[PDB]
């Protein structure tokens, strides 16, 4: 039996507010930054257009799963990329020419009740005075990001075939941090439905907000090293933060089907692949001034 | 804090119950966490372990100390909770511990009586089969 | 036959690995924890970033293997390890 | 200013003298070389002149050991002396000129004069 | 000294011969700057110290009677100057960057006999 | 420059020569942060500033950018009085000028006339 004993620290939580700074990056002494200006990027491969840099552009470090809010926006169109093509192991990621602009409500009322008669009603009561504690939806409007989809899958054709269709689907399953939406503001960790929001298929030659669900966590899964936390309870006043969505992570299935229909389902769960997606065109480099070319010439 | 309290009653050892996390559980009841904590409303975190349907939640809860009879602001016991879900193996356990198959809440309703209510006879069978060897 | 000549003032880079400093305009007058780390751990930003653009250069790109990434993404452990305290933690140290 | 920037003008002295004097004073000259606001705003801009002037003196450096002279004062160089750019005798320039009138009478010529160096010292190099 | 990298060998070889002639936020930005041109001439005198070596200090452009391998350069040499730039043939060679270095050394160590 | 010179001072002066060869072949916080930052930058103007008089004086003597050079100055036992054998083995470079601090200035004074006669030879 190899000995696995955990090791836990309780330390009075500050709960205190807590907003993303955008940060620059810039180089030390006798160090470079090399930036590409072309939009058709490709992720790996050459780039005309190298210019540099003495420091980077404003780089805001966020943490979300499934979606980006707070990044670069695209310069002409929507591009993706990918380590390996049909790899289905590595994670895609898109950058929306267009922002979608996200908005998310939680009710501070706290006066919803329900008139329950018979056995039970001290529990029924009990967890809907603690679940207004802990319920939220979010706003997502159909019509833009609609749009934004329909240029997305433009942008797929080209990768797979375009001969046949391809589809969305929702979180495959696992840890509640990689199938939900994880983002937070105020300092409070939300979980986001987002199966509603990947539900439609898309076939070729092709004002309502849809709601999405939200349960707040107090336990965690913290992203840094494996293991759990547990935070403070959730502020009494109302929480409501305005943001784009500038990025996207999807993990696509692959298909030994021979009708080989393309399934994508939405991934994410490295934030390396988050800050990858704001560092994708820039370049460390430092200077070496001496080299040497052979020739025919004599000494003395 | 480990027996940190809010102004509706519910220390973090009633959410680790209700959540169903048992590592959280285990390091509140190790640093010293209240395993009869109540809140305004009297629910001790052996309800929510118990209604939800965690099982070692509940054992963890019984053999730190919990109440099997604990009464809530209605009279509930563990036991009506278990019941009421179709939980039988929580039953099953709470037996085990001893819970009163007698106690009435304030509706003046029994486990056998909200066993019968619910449907499910497979648990009233194993409730009539312990208050017949009481 | 052919000898070796050496050659100076010639406009080579390679690529390599540094430690890079942060820079942010965090004016420090709020309480924020996430502000007090931008300043008491980088400097304030360039006023005016000198933008120097190549005719012809020929660059190859690979930001999967980027390193750059490597140092930030512990750089912001170090930013939530400072900024934000958990009421409880736990991690599994096994022999 | 203190140091190099000093020793910039430190060689200034004695510009009327002979032509022939300077030259020997070169080498004795050259051997001759040797409270919250002070340290943080003004200190900075000190070190600004220290360093341009280290900057000044380092292309200077450089500039000179172009010609294969990297740390003499004096050298002499194989580049033959075009009667064109003097037509006078060699006595008279080193026993009654100086080095101001003397510069005056070849600041035409001396932009030429730094390119022929620089070719006869890749021709040098070349063989 | 990295800008004009656009040309090619034998006119960066030409061109290296052209190139041979709030008071808190101000000082921690003077002092980077000043980090940057000190360690820029720290680097000069350094690379210069090392070509003090090689025999040819002070002098941009030099030549040795050190003998080069026809495998480092695999290649017939005669179109790398016209077309070829610097940065692809410094990666042609990276590998074979110490050895011939150790070579020079070594060369001056019997020139000096 | 000067700070990694001073590492493995004692050590005996002939592996001393050798490993000299290869070492040359090479909001109070922020105040606090700032203030040793220039007076490390101060350090190090001053290190460049030294050794470009030290290296003008070996253009004096005409070893301009060598480390180790040869002269032409014959050694005179009354400067030191020391065996040649145990000299490099048995004594430091720490040692050295200890024994010799009278005498340097007269050796420095005959090496840059005997680099003068050797110019005016030519
Ligand atoms: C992507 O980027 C956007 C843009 O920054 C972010 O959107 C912000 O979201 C936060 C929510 O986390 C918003 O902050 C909220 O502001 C409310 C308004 O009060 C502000 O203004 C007054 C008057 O100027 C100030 O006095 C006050 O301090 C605030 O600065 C606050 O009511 C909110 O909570 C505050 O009050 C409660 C009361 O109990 C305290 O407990 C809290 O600690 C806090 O002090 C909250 O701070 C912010 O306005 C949004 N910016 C906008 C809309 O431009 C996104 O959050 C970001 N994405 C992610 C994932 O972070
Ligand atoms: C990018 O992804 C593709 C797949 O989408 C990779 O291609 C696959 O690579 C594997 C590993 O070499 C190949 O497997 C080999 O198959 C042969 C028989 O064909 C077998 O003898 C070998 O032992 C090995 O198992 C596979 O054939 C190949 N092609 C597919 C799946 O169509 C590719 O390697 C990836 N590239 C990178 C850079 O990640
Ligand atoms: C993605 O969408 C699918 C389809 O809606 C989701 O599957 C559903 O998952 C829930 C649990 O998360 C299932 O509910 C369970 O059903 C069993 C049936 O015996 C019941 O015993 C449980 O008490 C519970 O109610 C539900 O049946 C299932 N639906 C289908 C059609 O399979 C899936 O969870 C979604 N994933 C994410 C990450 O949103
Ligand atoms: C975009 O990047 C991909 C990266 O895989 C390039 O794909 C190359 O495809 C050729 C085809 O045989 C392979 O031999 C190469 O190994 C692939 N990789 C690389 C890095 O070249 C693709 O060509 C790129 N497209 C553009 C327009 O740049
Ligand atoms: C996200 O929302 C979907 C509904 O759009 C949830 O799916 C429901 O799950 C419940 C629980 O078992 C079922 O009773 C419903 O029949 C499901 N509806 C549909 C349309 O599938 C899903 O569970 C939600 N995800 C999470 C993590 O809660
Ligand atoms: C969401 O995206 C919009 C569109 O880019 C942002 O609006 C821009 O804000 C910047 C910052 O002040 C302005 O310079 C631009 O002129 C704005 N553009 C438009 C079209 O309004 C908006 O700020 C983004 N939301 C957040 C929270 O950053
Ligand atoms: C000295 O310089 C003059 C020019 O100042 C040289 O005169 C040139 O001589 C060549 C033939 O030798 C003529 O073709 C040119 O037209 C002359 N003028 C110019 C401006 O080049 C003269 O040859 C030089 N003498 C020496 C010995 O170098
Ligand atoms: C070597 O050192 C000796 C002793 O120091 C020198 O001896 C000189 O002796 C004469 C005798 O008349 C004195 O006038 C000099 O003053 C002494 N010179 C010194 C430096 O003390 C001797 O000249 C030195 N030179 C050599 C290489 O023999
Ligand atoms: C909360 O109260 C306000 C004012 O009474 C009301 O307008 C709003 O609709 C309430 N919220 C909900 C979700 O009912
Ligand atoms: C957005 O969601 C909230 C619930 O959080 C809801 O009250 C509101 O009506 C929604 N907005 C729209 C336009 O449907
Ligand atoms: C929230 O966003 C939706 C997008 O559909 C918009 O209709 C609504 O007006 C927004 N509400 C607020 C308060 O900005
Ligand atoms: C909106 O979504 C539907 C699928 O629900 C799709 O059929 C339609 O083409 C979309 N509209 C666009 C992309 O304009
Ligand atoms: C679709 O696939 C075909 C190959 O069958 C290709 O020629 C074409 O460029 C692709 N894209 C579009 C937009 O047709
Ligand atoms: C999409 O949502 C609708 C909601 O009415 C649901 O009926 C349907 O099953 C979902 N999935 C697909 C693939 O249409
Ligand atoms: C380098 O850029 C200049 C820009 O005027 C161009 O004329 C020249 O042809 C380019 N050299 C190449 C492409 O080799
Ligand atoms: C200046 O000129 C006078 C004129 O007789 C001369 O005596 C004197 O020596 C000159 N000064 C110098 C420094 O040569
Ligand atoms: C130049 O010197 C020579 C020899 O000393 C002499 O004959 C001639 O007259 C002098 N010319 C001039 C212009 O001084
Ligand atoms: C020296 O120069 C002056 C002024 O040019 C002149 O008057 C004098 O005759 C010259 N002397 C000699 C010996 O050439
Ligand atoms: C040198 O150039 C100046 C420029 O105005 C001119 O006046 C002078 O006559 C020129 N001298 C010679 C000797 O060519
Ligand atoms: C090539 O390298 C080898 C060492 O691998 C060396 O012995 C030889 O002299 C070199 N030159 C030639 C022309 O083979
Ligand atoms: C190298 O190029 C020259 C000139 O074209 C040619 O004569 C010679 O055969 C070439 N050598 C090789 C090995 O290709
Ligand atoms: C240099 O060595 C590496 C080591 O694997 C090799 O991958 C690369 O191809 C080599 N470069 C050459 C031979 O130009
Ligand atoms: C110091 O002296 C010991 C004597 O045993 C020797 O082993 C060691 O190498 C010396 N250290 C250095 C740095 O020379
Ligand atoms: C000391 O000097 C003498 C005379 O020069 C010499 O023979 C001897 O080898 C030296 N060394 C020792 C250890 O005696
Ligand atoms: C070195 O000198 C010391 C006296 O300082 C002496 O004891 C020792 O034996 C000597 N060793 C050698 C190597 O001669
Ligand atoms: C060196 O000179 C000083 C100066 O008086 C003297 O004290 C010391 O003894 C001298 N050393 C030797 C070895 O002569």
Redesign the pocket.
């Given at each position: 039996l190899i000995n696995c004993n955990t090791s836990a620290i309780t330390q009075a939580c500050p709960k205190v507010s807590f907003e993303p700074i955008p940060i620059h990056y810039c180089a030390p002494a006798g160090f470079a930054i090399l930036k590409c200006k072309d939009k058709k990027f490709n992720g790996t491969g050459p780039c005309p257009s190298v210019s540099t840099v003495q420091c980077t552009h404003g780089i805001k470090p966020v943490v979300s799963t499934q979606l980006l809010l707070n990044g670069s926006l695209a310069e002409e169109e929507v591009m993706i990329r990918s380590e390996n093509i049909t790899n289905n192991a590595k994670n895609i990621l898109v950058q929306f020419n267009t922002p979608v602009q996200i908005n998310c409500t939680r009710p501070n009322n706290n006066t919803r009740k329900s008139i329950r008669i018979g056995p039970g009603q001290a529990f029924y009561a009990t967890g809907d005075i603690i679940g207004d504690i802990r319920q939220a939806h979010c706003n997502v409007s159909?019509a833009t990001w609609?749009?934004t989809?329909?240029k997305v899958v433009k942008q797929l054709r080209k990768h797979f075939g375009n001969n046949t269709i391809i589809r969305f689907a929702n979180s495959s399953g696992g840890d509640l941090e990689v199938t939900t939406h994880s983002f937070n503001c105020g300092g409070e960790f939300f979980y986001c439905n987002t199966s509603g929001l990947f539900?439609?298929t898309?076939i070729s030659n092709?004002n309502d907000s849809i709601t999405l669900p939200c349960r707040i966590k107090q336990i965690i899964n913290m992203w840094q090293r494996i293991g759990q936390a547990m935070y403070a309870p959730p502020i009494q006043g109302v929480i409501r933060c305005v943001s784009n969505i500038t990025g996207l992570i999807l993990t696509r299935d692959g298909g030994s089907t021979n009708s080989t229909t393309e399934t994508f389902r939405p991934g994410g769960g490295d934030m390396r692949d988050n800050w990858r997606s704001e560092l994708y065109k820039y370049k460390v480099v430092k200077i070496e001034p001496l080299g040497v070319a052979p020739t025919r010439c004599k000494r003395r | 804090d480990v027996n940190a309290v809010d102004v509706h009653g519910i220390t973090p050892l009633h959410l680790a119950a209700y959540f169903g996390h048992l590592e959280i559980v285990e390091v509140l009841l190790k640093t010293g966490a209240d395993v009869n904590a109540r809140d305004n409303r009297g629910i001790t975190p052996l309800h929510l372990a118990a209604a939800m349907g965690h099982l070692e939640i509940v054992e963890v809860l019984l053999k730190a100390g919990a109440d099997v009879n604990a009464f809530d602001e209605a009279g509930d016991t563990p036991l009506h909770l278990a019941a009421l879900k179709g939980h039988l193996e929580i039953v099953e356990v709470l037996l085990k511990h001893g819970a009163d198959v007698n106690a009435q809440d304030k509706f003046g309703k029994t486990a056998f009586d909200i066993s019968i209510d619910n449907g499910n006879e497979d648990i009233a069978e194993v409730l009539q089969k312990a208050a017949k060897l009481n | 036959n052919l000898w070796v000549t050496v050659y100076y003032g010639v406009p080579v880079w390679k690529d390599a690995e540094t430690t890079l400093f942060c820079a942010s305009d965090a004016k420090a007058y709020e309480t924020e924890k996430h502000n007090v780390w931008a300043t008491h751990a980088c400097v304030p930003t360039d006023p005016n970033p000198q933008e120097i653009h190549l005719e012809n250069v020929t660059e190859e790109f690979n930001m999967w293997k980027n390193n750059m990434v490597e140092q930030m993404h512990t750089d912001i452990i170090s930013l939530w390890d400072q900024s934000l305290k958990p009421c409880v933690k736990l991690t599994p140290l096994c022999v | 200013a203190v140091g190099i920037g000093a020793v910039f003008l430190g060689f200034l002295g004695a510009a009327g003298s002979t032509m022939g004097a300077a030259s020997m004073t070169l080498t004795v000259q050259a051997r001759n070389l040797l409270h919250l606001l002070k340290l943080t705003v003004w200190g900075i801009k000190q070190l600004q002149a220290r360093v341009l002037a280290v900057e000044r003196y380092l292309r200077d450096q450089q500039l000179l050991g172009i010609w294969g002279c990297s740390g003499k004062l004096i050298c002499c160089t194989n580049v033959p002396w075009n009667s064109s750019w003097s037509n006078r005798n060699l006595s008279e320039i080193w026993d009654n000129m100086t080095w101001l009138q003397w510069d005056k009478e070849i600041s035409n010529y001396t932009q030429i004069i730094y390119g022929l160096l620089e070719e006869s010292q890749n021709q040098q190099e070349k063989n």
């Amino acid at each position: 039996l190899i000995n696995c004993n955990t090791s836990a620290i309780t330390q009075a939580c500050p709960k205190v507010s807590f907003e993303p700074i955008p940060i620059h990056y810039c180089a030390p002494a006798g160090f470079a930054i090399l930036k590409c200006k072309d939009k058709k990027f490709n992720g790996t491969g050459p780039c005309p257009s190298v210019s540099t840099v003495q420091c980077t552009h404003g780089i805001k470090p966020v943490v979300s799963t499934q979606l980006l809010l707070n990044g670069s926006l695209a310069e002409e169109e929507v591009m993706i990329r990918s380590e390996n093509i049909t790899n289905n192991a590595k994670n895609i990621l898109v950058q929306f020419n267009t922002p979608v602009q996200i908005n998310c409500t939680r009710p501070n009322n706290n006066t919803r009740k329900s008139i329950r008669i018979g056995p039970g009603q001290a529990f029924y009561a009990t967890g809907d005075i603690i679940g207004d504690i802990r319920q939220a939806h979010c706003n997502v409007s159909k019509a833009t990001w609609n749009e934004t989809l329909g240029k997305v899958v433009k942008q797929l054709r080209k990768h797979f075939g375009n001969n046949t269709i391809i589809r969305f689907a929702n979180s495959s399953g696992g840890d509640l941090e990689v199938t939900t939406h994880s983002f937070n503001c105020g300092g409070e960790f939300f979980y986001c439905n987002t199966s509603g929001l990947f539900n439609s298929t898309w076939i070729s030659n092709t004002n309502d907000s849809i709601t999405l669900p939200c349960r707040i966590k107090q336990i965690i899964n913290m992203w840094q090293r494996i293991g759990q936390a547990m935070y403070a309870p959730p502020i009494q006043g109302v929480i409501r933060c305005v943001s784009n969505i500038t990025g996207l992570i999807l993990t696509r299935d692959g298909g030994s089907t021979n009708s080989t229909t393309e399934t994508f389902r939405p991934g994410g769960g490295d934030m390396r692949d988050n800050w990858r997606s704001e560092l994708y065109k820039y370049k460390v480099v430092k200077i070496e001034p001496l080299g040497v070319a052979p020739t025919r010439c004599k000494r003395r | 804090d480990v027996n940190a309290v809010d102004v509706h009653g519910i220390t973090p050892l009633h959410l680790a119950a209700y959540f169903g996390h048992l590592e959280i559980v285990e390091v509140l009841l190790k640093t010293g966490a209240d395993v009869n904590a109540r809140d305004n409303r009297g629910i001790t975190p052996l309800h929510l372990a118990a209604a939800m349907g965690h099982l070692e939640i509940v054992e963890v809860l019984l053999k730190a100390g919990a109440d099997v009879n604990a009464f809530d602001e209605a009279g509930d016991t563990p036991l009506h909770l278990a019941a009421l879900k179709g939980h039988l193996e929580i039953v099953e356990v709470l037996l085990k511990h001893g819970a009163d198959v007698n106690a009435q809440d304030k509706f003046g309703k029994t486990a056998f009586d909200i066993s019968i209510d619910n449907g499910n006879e497979d648990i009233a069978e194993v409730l009539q089969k312990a208050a017949k060897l009481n | 036959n052919l000898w070796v000549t050496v050659y100076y003032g010639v406009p080579v880079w390679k690529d390599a690995e540094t430690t890079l400093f942060c820079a942010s305009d965090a004016k420090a007058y709020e309480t924020e924890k996430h502000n007090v780390w931008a300043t008491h751990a980088c400097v304030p930003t360039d006023p005016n970033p000198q933008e120097i653009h190549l005719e012809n250069v020929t660059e190859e790109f690979n930001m999967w293997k980027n390193n750059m990434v490597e140092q930030m993404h512990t750089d912001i452990i170090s930013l939530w390890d400072q900024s934000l305290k958990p009421c409880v933690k736990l991690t599994p140290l096994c022999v | 200013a203190v140091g190099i920037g000093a020793v910039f003008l430190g060689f200034l002295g004695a510009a009327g003298s002979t032509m022939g004097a300077a030259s020997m004073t070169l080498t004795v000259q050259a051997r001759n070389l040797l409270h919250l606001l002070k340290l943080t705003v003004w200190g900075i801009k000190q070190l600004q002149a220290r360093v341009l002037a280290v900057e000044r003196y380092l292309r200077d450096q450089q500039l000179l050991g172009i010609w294969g002279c990297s740390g003499k004062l004096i050298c002499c160089t194989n580049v033959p002396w075009n009667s064109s750019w003097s037509n006078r005798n060699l006595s008279e320039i080193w026993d009654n000129m100086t080095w101001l009138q003397w510069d005056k009478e070849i600041s035409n010529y001396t932009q030429i004069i730094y390119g022929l160096l620089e070719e006869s010292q890749n021709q040098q190099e070349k063989n």
